[PDB]
Design an enzyme around this catalytic site. Sequence first.
Site, short mmCIF file in Angstrom:
data_model
loop_
_atom_site.label_atom_id
_atom_site.label_comp_id
_atom_site.label_asym_id
_atom_site.label_seq_id
_atom_site.Cartn_x
_atom_site.Cartn_y
_atom_site.Cartn_z
N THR A 1 0.85 -1.22 0.00
CA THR A 1 0.00 0.00 0.00
C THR A 1 0.87 1.25 0.00
O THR A 1 1.94 1.26 0.59
CB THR A 1 -0.94 0.03 1.22
OG1 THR A 1 -2.01 -0.91 1.03
CG2 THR A 1 -1.53 1.43 1.43
N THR A 2 0.40 2.29 -0.68
CA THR A 2 1.07 3.58 -0.72
C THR A 2 0.02 4.66 -0.54
O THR A 2 -0.90 4.77 -1.36
CB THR A 2 1.82 3.79 -2.04
OG1 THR A 2 2.81 2.77 -2.20
CG2 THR A 2 2.48 5.15 -2.06
#
Lengths: 230, 229, 222, 237, 229, 216, 235, 216, 227
Positions: free
Chosen positions: H1-2
């Site tokens: 995830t970013t």
Amino acid sequence: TLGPVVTGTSVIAIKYKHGIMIAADRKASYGSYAKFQNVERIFKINNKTVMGFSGELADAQYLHELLTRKNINNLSEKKRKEDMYTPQHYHSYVSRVFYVRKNRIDPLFNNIIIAGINSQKYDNNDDNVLLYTNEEYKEIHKDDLYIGFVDMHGTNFCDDYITTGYARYFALTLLRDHYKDNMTEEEARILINECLRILYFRDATSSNFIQIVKVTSKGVEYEEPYILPC
Amino acid sequence: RYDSRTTTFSPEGRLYQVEYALEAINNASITIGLITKDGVILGADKSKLIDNYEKIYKIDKHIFCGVAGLNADANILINQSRLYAQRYLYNYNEVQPVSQLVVQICDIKQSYTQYGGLRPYGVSFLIGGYDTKDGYQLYHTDPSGNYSGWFATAIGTNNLTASSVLKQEWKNDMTLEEGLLLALKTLAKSTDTEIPKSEKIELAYLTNVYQKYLTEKEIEELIKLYTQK
Amino acid sequence: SYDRAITVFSPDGHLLQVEHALEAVKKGGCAVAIKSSNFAVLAVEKKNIPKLQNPKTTEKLIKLDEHNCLAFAGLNADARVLVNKTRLECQRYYLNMDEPAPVDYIAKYVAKVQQKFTHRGGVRPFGIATLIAGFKNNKEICIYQTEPSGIYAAWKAQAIGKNAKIVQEFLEKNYQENMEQKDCIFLALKAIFEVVELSSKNVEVALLTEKDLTFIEEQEIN
Amino acid sequence: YDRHLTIFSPDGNLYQIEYAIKAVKNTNITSVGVKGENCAVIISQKKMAKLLDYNNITNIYNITDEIGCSMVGMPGDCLSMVYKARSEASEFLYSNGYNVNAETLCRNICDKIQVYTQHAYMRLHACSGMIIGIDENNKPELFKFDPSGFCAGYRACVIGNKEQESISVLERLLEKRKTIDEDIRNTTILAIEALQTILAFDLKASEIEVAIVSTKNRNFTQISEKEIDNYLTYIAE
Amino acid sequence: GVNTFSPEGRLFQVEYALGAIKLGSTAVGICVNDGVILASERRISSTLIEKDSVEKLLSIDDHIGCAMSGLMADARTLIDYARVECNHYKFIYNENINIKSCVELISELALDFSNLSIMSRPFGVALLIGGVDKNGPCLWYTEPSGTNTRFSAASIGSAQEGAELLLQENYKKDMTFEQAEILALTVLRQVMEDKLSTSNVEICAIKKSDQTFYKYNTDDISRIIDVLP
Amino acid sequence: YSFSLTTFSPTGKLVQIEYALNRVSSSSPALGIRAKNGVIIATEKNELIEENSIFKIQQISEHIGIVYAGMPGDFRVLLKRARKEAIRYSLQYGSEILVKELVKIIASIVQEFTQTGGVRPFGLSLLICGVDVYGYHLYQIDPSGCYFNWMATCVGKDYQNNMSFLEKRYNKDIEIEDAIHTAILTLKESYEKNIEIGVAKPFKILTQNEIKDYLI
Amino acid sequence: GYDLSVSTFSPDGRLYQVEYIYKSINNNNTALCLECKDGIICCCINSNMDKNKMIKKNSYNRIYHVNNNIIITYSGFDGDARNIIDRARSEANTYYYNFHTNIPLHILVNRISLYIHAYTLYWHMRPFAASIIISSFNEKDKGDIYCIEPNGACYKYSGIVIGKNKEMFKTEIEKKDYKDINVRDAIEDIYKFILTSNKNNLQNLVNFSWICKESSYEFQNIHEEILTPALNKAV
Amino acid sequence: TTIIGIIYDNGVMLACDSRTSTFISNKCSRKINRINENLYVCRSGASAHSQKIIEIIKHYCVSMKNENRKKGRFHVTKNKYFYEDKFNDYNPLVENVAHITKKIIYTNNNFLSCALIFGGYDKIKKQQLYAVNLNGSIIEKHDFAVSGSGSIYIQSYLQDKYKKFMTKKECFNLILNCVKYAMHNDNSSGGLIRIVNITKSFVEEFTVVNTQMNFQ
Amino acid sequence: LYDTDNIIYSPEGRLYQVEYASEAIKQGTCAVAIKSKDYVVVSGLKKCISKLSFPQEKIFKIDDYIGISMSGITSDAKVLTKFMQNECLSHKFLYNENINIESLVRSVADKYQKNTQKSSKRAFGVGLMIAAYHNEPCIFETRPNGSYFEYDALSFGARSHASKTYLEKNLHLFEECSLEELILHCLKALKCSLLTISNTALAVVGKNHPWQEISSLQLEEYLSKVK
């Protein structure tokens, strides 16, 4: 809080001629990641008491909220400047908090320095306390200055100068070798800056972006944060 | 100021709530019971659109009860009695003796007259049953948790006339059919009627264990028999 | 009245609820207890409607545990509840102490329970008085009487229930200290029969010995 | 002491309910709710039940973004009912994952009023309420509840002093009546005229508060005093 | 209610309890430099009782005794609580509790019905608690009002006024223990209606020499009677 | 604080229950008729009140419906409780709750309020009509907590006359529609917008058009 | 017979116990808050303590604060008022824990009103005998003053008087607009109103405080060198 | 995830990927959740923990927003929405919501592993970015905040390209390039890019399809 | 019908149960407290109920620099005394300082007020005067209704009107009086209410002088000086 995640590094505090001077770098870390570099690790408790922390940031913030509530309650029940809680009162409160958490195996992963001036005899700032807006310095005896250390287990004591974290090795050697009574502000800054330079050189978690706070006859002064000269 | 002090003694060592509950039961419809060699009997007298036993209830394969007083309190106590019987079987792996169940239900009755600020149960029971230790047993339980054992007794309205008839007629060596005829005769006498009507009768019997709850047609047959004599 | 105080002090200093529990005791049937060298006799009045009531159902001469027996006068359901509490305490003592509950300990427990019910909010006083016969730790036999208030006292011979004063006055002039079982029973009967109608169906008399409590067969009563 | 507690009397009535209804009527505050085809409007007298802040005085509250109410009664009870309604709405949203509608809210509020009505140790709230919102089927809501715990849906309802003579007013107006913007405007005009009729005196734009829910803008919102003044002037002609 | 004040500022319940302590047998407590002596009458109600089963003088602890007046059932509860608390103090601190501390514990229990910070009413008992602590012999009086008063010599029971008057008349600080016994029995004889005898009275003493609760036997009582005027 | 507000009168009556009965008797009429192939519950009710929002007849479960005569708020509470108990039984046993058992559970809940402290009795009477593997049932629950098993009954104002009418027009072997006609006649004797009817297929409540179709 | 419990409505819908509380509050010392041009001024007049000559001078104070920026005064019982003020401080502390900012005034007033009103619902609690005043003054929003009744009603004013003689104080206060008057001009006016509603006990029977620009919009008792000239001019 | 958040003059911009879980359980997951019309938050860490935390915080935000309302009257695919509240009268402050989130996460930080980035706008502090870290420590960022396993790769990149007062267009380009580089380097991030732009008067929501071309 | 319950108001807006709890304070023994710039002196009459009786204790020590005197029901006074003593000790244990006197008095007033709001409870039927030195000699008075005040001089109990009048006549001397003259003033005030070493209690507290009861010989000589 199983362990520390976001950590703050060393904090130094000393007594000098005009009061208390407490230094800490403005950096927080995420393991070996220098994720935050403008963090405020010294907290003003009240006009004559300030708080420095090392270790977990969340636990330090929780403790700061607790002390903020206590200060507001005290101001609410205050009538004269002598009713204001002293730094020693807040040190004992923090020690009791840490002890009760030790008995519940739910410690705050911090080392705390509660510093300030115990006497209302050197000024009249607390006759009309101002919470939202900010002559010469009066000489303060070293007995009227309080510096108290507390650790995770609740080990509480006081001294003329206190250090936390890696400062307890690097800075403390210089402090014990060179500290003297009734120091001027210039000398106190020189000593603390030498200690912080050593820490910057030998502590991977330390930063050269410093925060100096003074607790003096004219209250708590937050200095302009500065990068360490050389 | 709004409290009525239901669990207080009257000046005479009497509990007014218990006495008023006794009065209410005395104004209830008459239920009777008697012991024969074959088993236990319970009789009871119940708008034309009513569909439905409302006086005799089964508590366990070997225990059944005739009611007098308030029907809702009777239902609560009957449910609690079924709970006690089943819990005894659960705990010991044997059926509960009748006297033990009567003692438990009467304790529940009495705690309402000793504890709290509630009213007593306004119901009285005729508990009939069979167990191996004491054979056939019939018990009377009043609202205060007192109980007694009987060979034949009556509860409800005009219980005195039914009691006199039972004492005059009840023998020790009477069979199921003779016991049923005596039950019908007592039910008729307590209603001040020469003939008992087969719509106002609730007869059931427990024998060694099996319980019979007589339908209207079987009641009609018993009525024919009772009328021949 | 979940927590409302039921027993309170009257303007004169009395606890009317206790006098009402005493009235309840006075309404009950008569019982008599007489102590001898190493046995006791308890004779209680019984009243049942002949031919219809089972005479075995009512037991006012109660065995409490191995060595202690009880009789009561007053409300029957209260008596049963208090008796069950007493039996539970006898077994609890014998479990924690590894020794059977002495008569005096049981009587004191019954007295403290009655006092408690006289001194707590949301409870009615027990309307019963008891005579408890048993043996002490030194194997001495004793008879105790407990009242609705929670007061208790030991006796040589004592009668409770309705017309207890007359039976007391009679037993005072007749209790000749150590007496043989047969004539001790006869005394226990001729004292109780001064108030109840003379009939073998109006009494049940039992005798407590170091071995057990035995109810007297009706032939002797006849 | 038969009329003190929430218990039955020899006639079977609970007189405390009648007394709480009388308390609601005593407040001398009138509120009127009117349903349109795609809109609902609530208008209140914006008066208390010289140095006083007249803007702060209101009988209209906003339970959720899209549901609003007018509570008339003793002010403490009104605020307590508003807060209980808001707690019910937040609980329903959190537990079920979507925003409650006015019907469910009124029925839950009555489910709570009934506990007061039955448990003798609490006092009845002398608070009556209108609740309006927009249904999941894009239709207006208008439900009215009283201290008795009776909730009913309405096409037009009134809380206040004059009933059984303010009912015929709404009846005649609605049978006279029988674009989304035009529907909203006509509903607002009808509500303002209904309040003016019921009160029997000329209204002032600063002494009345009008709020609306509509399919165009479901958010329960209050309309500024300029628009209310314009509507009053239009009614005057 | 139980916690209601009167218009004069006195609780009704403790005021009514004051009338209860005036009943029961009369006891006398005398304190002298050598020790404290409590002597009580016994109005034996009948000859069929076991005289020694009824006790008016009890030992709250080895060094503490107490004479009891009022409702004896309540008094036994108070003395049992005192015994439990004194033993708890002895265990926690490994020393004999001060007498005043014991009396204050009894008092705090006695007013627990108020619920300021569980019994349902005041106790209705008067305690004459004597003992010997490090301070020496001492004697205290506790009453249902909760107020506890230290006395050189005091009396309680039905003949409290007469016994108190006599003790005031005949008490002086410079008194031997034998004189204390003689005076106690003189007052007791003058107050009770049943003629004084070796079986009529109880005498218990806690002496400074040993600070131990000693209950007199028949021989000691007969001796004191032999020394009486 | 918790003490019974319902107490035995000196003659042995529970006057609060009698008063709740008086209240129910001063309430709007409702009735039920148990047919040979079904059971129906009917009830009788200012140009502003929405009809759909105040239906007295309600659905306990797919084959169980309920109507009331008395206090609307108490009815709402007891309806929610009955739905809760039916769902609890369904969770326990995986089948729809039997009508008689639901009647017993609700009867116990109603009786609780006649004995527990600090509560008045429910001021309503209930008619519960349902279908199970054991046929069609029509039960009445009183404020006291007692439940009667009926073939037909009426539970509101002037219910003596309506009971007499039902008695003089009831036959066991009656189609559903014959019973529905008898019910409408009984309600019109007590008195299409004034009529609400539910019938037992899963329990159904007749639409206004259907009711008018029956009024012909 | 409908006025023995707080939880019973009279036939006319009234709750008599609350009316009795209102009479009690109307019989107690005077208090007022006045919103001026640059701040709010709270003044408490302890008229019924003139007979207590032996009380420490200026020791009794009915004026309290919350967060240092909210003035809270009252007219009623000291115990009940202290209870209410403790609850207000607890609410503020909980709010700051939750959200890290000071509680808005209106939210605090609503919560205090709910707290008061919760005590008029049960038959085993005594309702509070105290009218409350909660006031604040901000640089941007100017002044906001709320009066809470013993029944839970809260209302917003530009100037409020509670206690005895409050009608005469209201009439004298309304006589001129104080929105265009500075606090210092108002001190003399309040002293004159107190005198006309004695000369000796003004310095020892009156609590004064403001929240104005001179005090950085934070709570502060009025210093003596400011009050003495005004009460002298009034005399 | 970013998850990333940047501050430009006149607004703040949140951006996130949409990959969930070495098996991509959900290749299009909504990480930027809309707490309020003016206040959004990005999730990272345990999906269940963050989702439940968001639900709780939405509940609290609804409570706060309703309670704030004073009495009386006053006075590449894109989706844009103006604020219903034109003056931020009742919209809860960004700091309040972020700090209550920090409190919730810290109280239960023995097992709640959730990292959040709050972006928002209120009239007090204008546009705000807050970072709630693992154990429940909140830090207010005035330039930008990053989190997730994929945001470590862009740190230096971002630090080089951020400017104090970026314009909306160049800020959008910067945040898009940041997310694209993060997904290129991080295996645990990917899918369509979701961007939210919060401003004084409106919020825009952009969805971007992507491809990383370079001739290094 | 309005004095029956603790939670009811009269039409006059009055609590009659609390006023009766206060009326319980008029029948206690007279006690007086006065202060100068450094000291507080508390003097009280010990009650004697018989010749063979020992005089009832009148003043109690709460903390090193805190003491109290009581008037009213004595069991309630003991409960309050234990509360205050545990409070001072708990403060000195949690922190390393003496408790603020205003804080302790306010907590005691909270304890008083709590009892007044519930039907199941009754107000404390005792009035307390608290004498301490917390940077200054301070006298406080608590009341059953939960209100407390701070006094220059104070007296309450039976026949305190004479002690009142004397104190009101001599108030302007107390500030500038010395310890011996302050003690004699308090003793003369106490005498107006009517002293021997047995029926009079006398304690002092002040700057660098912990709470201390005056000894028997000291009291005898002081009473002689009074004569």
